[model samples]
Target: KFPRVKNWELGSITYDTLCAQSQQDGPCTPRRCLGSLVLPRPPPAEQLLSQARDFINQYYSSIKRSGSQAHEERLQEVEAEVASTGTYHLRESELVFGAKQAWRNAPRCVGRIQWGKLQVFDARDCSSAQEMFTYICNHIKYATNRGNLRSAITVFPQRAPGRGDFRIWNSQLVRYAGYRQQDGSVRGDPANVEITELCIQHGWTPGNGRFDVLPLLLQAPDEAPELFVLPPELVLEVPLEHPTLEWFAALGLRWYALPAVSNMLLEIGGLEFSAAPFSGWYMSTEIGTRDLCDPHRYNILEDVAVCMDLDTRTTSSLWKDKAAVEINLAVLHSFQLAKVTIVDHHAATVSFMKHLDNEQKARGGCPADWAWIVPPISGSLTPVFHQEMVNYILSPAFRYQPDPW
Candidate 1:
């Protein structure tokens, strides 16, 4: 029997029939439900032909041409190519489809509503880090689009036989360098300290500012990674401000407009794309709550609370909660003033609920991780927190890859 999913707020029910097709097993069993873990451990594949055949069928079926002569011919072409060279390639159209599908299948993302609108850039012909930098620069420019950001992804060449994989060493395309202060404090984003050090070691000059943008460390197959500076004008950043709290702008906080994740692996069919960097517009909580307030990241909660003169002497003060709300409002106002696209937690979560409805009707069910789908600061306030989700693996997924180093 399919799992019965329920929405506690709406009192609606859904039976997840799509999870039956999951080829990979999740950590949950009859005895336990490990649904809240951020990163799921792998239970992992198949011979190339088997995966290739399944993807080929998926591609054909999507176009209402399942088992047609064209579909059969495409499958034969793939089989021949794989038999000849031990791997196959995707058609440009096929790559675009697969990339969009990967985004749609990603469980941790709450912005899956825009998955189909991505502009896929094919960098398969790229041969050097310099070329990769050029492609990435172009990607940033197009995605930024003068602050009216659009979702885009630039996919470099797939992992080839016996050769090294093309890779991006940074977790994100644009990240503030975390300078390890002499007094053992982090001056910028703590999440990027290692990447910042790597950039400095690669013959780049270090900056003393709190929000120094790191350069790209791109690697071509069988070659040392090359460093390239992102042209400052290409990176669109929104300066955080609050409409009501004028003092907030003086804090001098800002975040990049494009949220381009660079280190995730894109698996389509049997092919692996180790350097497929994708970008979407920011969901405000990702910046305001998690990025700025997370204890191990920026850790700005206490500072903001003190600036607001909130009673920090006691846990009952609820000072952090008040500061967090103002910070979130600042993000919304700042992005609006800058004409950059940003979704607040309330709007993003509401849209995600609608996405759940859309997916349930279209795909029989959506694969979602509750911990990720719910907003970080106000979990119970969002409808997603009240809804039960079924987590499972699906094809053409975006998965975390290890550091190139």
Candidate 2:
């Protein structure tokens, strides 16, 4: 049975028939709906032949040629290749379509509205860690576009039975170093402590600053990761400063212009791209709230609240909430001032609502994770918060892969 989805804001309703296409299952049952888990656990190959054929079917379908003889020929072509070599390859256009499809099917991304606009850089020809670093730098430069960020993904070689995978060890292409102090506190972004330690262990000289941009640990197939520093200019950064609160600049806060997820695997037709680094511009709340104010990350809420002379002693003061607003404002203002692409929570959620409407017509209903689609702050105030969504997995898809180090 298909699920009934609704939007309380517009009093509209739709049944998600597309979710029936989902081969993966969510953690839901008659007992209770465990639909809000941050990550859903996830499959195989003739198995390989089947998936490959399905992707070809999808590719032809997207181009309005599903039943054409060329389509069937492509399908049989895949069959013949996999029948002989156990796998098939995607055409360059197919790779582009697959990459865009993966981002469109990403349930947790609020920015899927821009999915079709992605600039795909196929680095599948890459054969070494040094080459991977060069490709990554190129991706950063093109995606950053000197702060006018463009959504893009650079896909390295796919996983082959002949060798190990080409892997980028960083979760994101850009991250701050986290130096653990003697007293067990983190000096920088605590989220990156493990990778920071890994970088240090792999011969990256430790930077003692709070926001030192970490280098790339590029790993080619079956090889130990090699350390490669991102050229400082390629890693475009925006120095955050509040428009109204001038002293906030003294905190020396800064963030990277591009939000590229570097470690996810790209699955297209049964082939796996273990090093497809995709980047998009920031959604203000991602940096302002979670990265800067999350208790475990930078933990700057109290600092901002104190600087604002707010009562941090009691919950009634809503000091954290007040500080969060200011920080988000700072992010938006800084990005705008720096000519960097960024979207505020309000604007972003409204755009997401439009995306949902488009997807509703295009695919029966959109697969969305409410926890992620709805902005972190002002939940009930956003259109997505009032919408009932179905969550499912779809290919081509970006999937979490195990860390090599």
Candidate 3:
């Protein structure tokens, strides 16, 4: 038996076979790394050859050089390189293409409609933690765009065999503090309690509040990680409020405008970027349902229900349900009022369905995890609920990386 497949994040894929294999070793097998925990085997020589051929064909077709001498020569060169090195490096143009393709092939994300339009920052030359911090800050500023959010990814150098990998210690560029209070309760986000303690252990002083932005721990090869605090103005936050219920703002609730995930790995063409921080605009329910309402996180549903004078004692009255709707509504309204880019769950899923149809015609099939494709709230109400789905891994994927520690 295998662990039940849970949707861990937006683009992760988990298979039971991989989990069983992982149990034999520590976290990874000889052929695979831990991220998705599938222990991905390096493609066979024949498979690599086929992929090279397909990539070459696509590259030539895209640049209008199909059937040209340059195309034929490139193909021959690819063959020769693979024969010599057992693997070949992708050209800058090819890397760009592969990055977008990776986003397109992401199984759990519902925001693939903008896959082709993502701004790719190539920081593959960054050799130090300071440079990584600079690149990260630049990415945050560019992607945040003063509340006009943009989809972007900043890629670090590829993983080299027998060499230490670069990593960003924070889960997201912007996150709330989670201090374990003296009374055994959490002051901020309970989900971030471990990370918060890690920051404190690293000699960074954490503010005692719900909205403190965690510092970035940038680790370079063989060097102790350095902590860098993000500038406050670069991080935009929305103060939550309801359209009709003015008391909602008085609850002292707010969230960062950006959800730039910093811990994922980007693997394109066998080159793994252990520190690739990427972000898309937030879908409303990510904040409303999970971050704010989940028991281990903010756990504010009962508080909001009591504030609204709802019958909290009876499950039949759906007090939690009623409270959750208003909380979601307030989040949506606040972001819109602040002119920050946010999509509601309904519209996002409809867009994903269209993306599915488009991928079906273009790639022959689309990979998806059913639990993730369905919205956290109002699951049956969305069209994705009725659709049968399949999940599989595709190359050029974004995957979960183990914590740097």
Candidate 4:
């Protein structure tokens, strides 16, 4: 049930296995070139965002058209032949990375931190948020290659004034320092706040709306209780290591260590590499449990790589002229898809009442829809991605950068 793309094949990728079932075919429509749409279309959409979307479409189009007829038919034949199946892949122009910053080689660095136990605190604990921040601050203090311990909290104006310190007064929302647990549970050791600085990273805020700075300041800020925090002396800004513009401004460099499966990969440039074997990367994100950050825990599998691009600056309305740059840089992106199973039929039953001797093994019982297992989800789905971006620029992939596992 998809809208037709004039020359592209519709249900093929999505309904490959279903098509494999015995059924008379309908009138064939003119074959169409299925232009790719990056998965999980953004909510509330934007125009520049289309820059990303458009790039992806062009990327896929170029590749599909470049292949030989044999190549195209092979793709079709594979789809026709495969049983219940799914796949994930990168299909388009080579992921491009650029930057105004020139470097002889990809910068190499290692970041690791123990996911030391986190202290949970009560919301109204008054000093709870403060204390938890302090603790986080202390941890960074001893971190061998450490920096400042900044904190960030999501602040919503109380529905009524004076609820927590509001009074229906001026814009009434104030910055409160804190952290959220994996479950989104607030865990600030206010009595022992590990954070010393509160970095405001998201939501609305006063000032010149340097929308450009917004994405870059995504990480904890250096200032206290403001949007974004960074231990300037500690935080290191390396050239963008990923090829896609997607990972531009990220965080937790100290946490971007190689994933456990990293070593098992075929080293293509240090990180692992793989690609989708078929059409659009169609894998599930298990209904609801995923967010934009963690990619490793989802049903799909992927490996990382880096890219480079040029950087340049443009003015913003939010903040004053800031360090803006068009990325001409390199960064990591998942290049592989993992294998999974597809069930053609889940459950069903049959009956056999012919003979007693034959009945021994013929007892009518249950049968299930058979499944054709195969690969899943092409790339970039899950909260792990949030962490991935953060790791790309702000921290490492491991440690407290967030996770699905």
What shift in Å separates residue 275 of candidate 1 from its native position after superposition? Answer: 0.3
lDDT of 2 by residue, 1-405 (tens): 988887888898889988877876678888998887655550343698878888899999999988999998888888788877777788999999999999999999999899989999989888899998888888888888887888999989988886888888999989999999999998988999999999999999998999999998999888899999988867788999999898999999999888989878898887899999998888999999999989999999998999999999999989899999999999999999999999988888899989988997898877888878888898988888999888888878888878887
User: Residue 376 in model 3: shift from native, Å?
Assistant: 0.5
Candidate 4 lDDT, 117-216, residue by residue in tens: 1111111122322333343333323331222212111111111112222111101011113343466433221211122111223333423211111111
- State which candidate has the highest lDDT: 1
What overall lDDT goes with each candidate model?
A: 0.89, 0.88, 0.82, 0.20
| Clash count, one per candidate | 0, 1, 0, 135
**Worst lDDT window (10 residues) for model 1?**
37-46
Q: Of the pair 2 and 4, which is ahead by TM-score?
A: 2
Residue lDDT tens for model 3, 69-179: 998998888888778766676777877887787788677888888888988899989989999989999998999998899999888887765678888888898888899
Local error of candidate 1 at 329, Å?
0.6
lDDT of 1 by residue, 1-405 (tens): 899999999899999999987776778899988887756670012387788788888889889999999999999999898877788899998999899988999888899988879999999999899999999999999999998889999999998767899999999999999989888899888888899998989998989887888999999998989999999999888888889887888998999898999999999988999999999899999999999999999888998899899999988989989999989889889999999999988888888888989999999999998888888898998878899998899988888777889
Give the TM-scores of the predictions, in the order they appear. 0.97, 0.97, 0.86, 0.18
lDDT of 1 at 160: 76
Error of 1 at 303 (Å): 1.7
Q: Which wins on lDDT, candidate 3 or candidate 4?
A: 3
- Could you give the C-alpha RMSD of every candidate to the true structure, in order shown? 1.9, 1.6, 6.8, 25.7
- The 10-residue segment of model 2 with minimum total lDDT is 37-46
